[PDB]
Amino acid sequence: FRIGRSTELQNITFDMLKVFEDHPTSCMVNHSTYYVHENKNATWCLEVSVTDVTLLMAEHDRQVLNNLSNCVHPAVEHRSRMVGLLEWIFRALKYDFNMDPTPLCQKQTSTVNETRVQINITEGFGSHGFEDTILQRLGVLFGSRIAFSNGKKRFLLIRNSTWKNQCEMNHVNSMHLMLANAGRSSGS
């Protein structure tokens, strides 16, 4: 691009792969579905979804009360990394376990082979504006416009899954995730 007879408009594009290969990243499939990935070579991931379907019940499932680690089965080989990444996500949400609604996770004898963590974001369950806080935090973390949309039941659900390259990693999302988790060790 030639601005004038002695001036040219030039550009450079960065490659942020080696900076963020070994750190947690995230990406958006659509405005309701997000994926968090421990590092590039991890064969598993955690998807975060805004749902209108009640998947866990207080009468059948476990309350997360300072025991989030119990929500992952002891036989999972990446159990420690899974619990870590769950904590990374909870810090990224600015979640306050003292005042925010108590999350639910699946019963210990669940037949389904995935870890569910359910936060009730239905209006009136938490304080006024708690659901808007969660949706706007999702927009900050993943670039979601779900907060900018039109009182039924909603839930923020984090479930584990196998990594199938569902979405391409976003290094801006990586910077948001790491900034919300300053001081927590990462990178191998």
Binding site: F1, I3, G4, S6, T7, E8, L9, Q10, N11, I12, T13, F14, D15, M16, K18, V19, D22, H23, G139, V140, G143, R145, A147, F148, H171, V172, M175, H176, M178, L179, N181, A182, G183, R184, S185, S186, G187, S188
Partner: protein, 152 residues
């Protein structure tokens, strides 16, 4: 000046930015390019084992600038997504401005005309800067007393 390794960029070319343009990084707090340079320098000096990126991510990346760009993205406003940066280069002399972020709308890079005023005037500044450093360089070497003697 400081230059970027082949793995830093995607153009497969060597890019050295002079210290004159990079000296504006310390004063500016709205330059995403300077934040990217700080990240890349930290990563390079770490590569050449414990990763300390989470301890210094606040020092390298401005949370306020990232938040502002994210909020612009959420409002369907042009925003910086920290990938492509444009700069004005005086080809004959090699002097150049500090690179500025190439904005994005609708998951598409902003067209050159859509921010023409950003790089027209910027280009002007470069020329003016190239005509203002010469005066300062001469003034740095020659004292005011010598000029006074020439008057009389």
């Amino acid at each position: 000046g400081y230059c970027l390794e082949r793995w830093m960029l995607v153009t497969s070319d060597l890019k050295c930015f002079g210290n004159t343009a990079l000296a504006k990084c310390n004063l500016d707090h709205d330059s995403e390019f300077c934040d990217m340079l700080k990240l890349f320098e930290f990563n390079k000096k770490a590569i050449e084992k414990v990763n300390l990126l989470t301890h210094s991510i606040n020092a390298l990346i401005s949370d306020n600038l990232l938040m502002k760009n994210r909020l612009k993205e959420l409002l369907n406003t042009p925003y910086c997504n920290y990938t492509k940066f444009w700069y004005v280069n005086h080809t004959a002399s090699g002097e150049h401005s500090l690179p500025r972020c190439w904005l994005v709308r609708n998951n598409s890079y902003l067209n050159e005309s859509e921010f023409r005023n950003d790089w027209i005037i910027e280009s002007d500044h470069l020329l003016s800067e190239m005509l203002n450093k010469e005066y300062i360089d001469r003034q740095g070497k020659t004292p005011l007393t010598l000029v006074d003697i020439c008057f009389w």
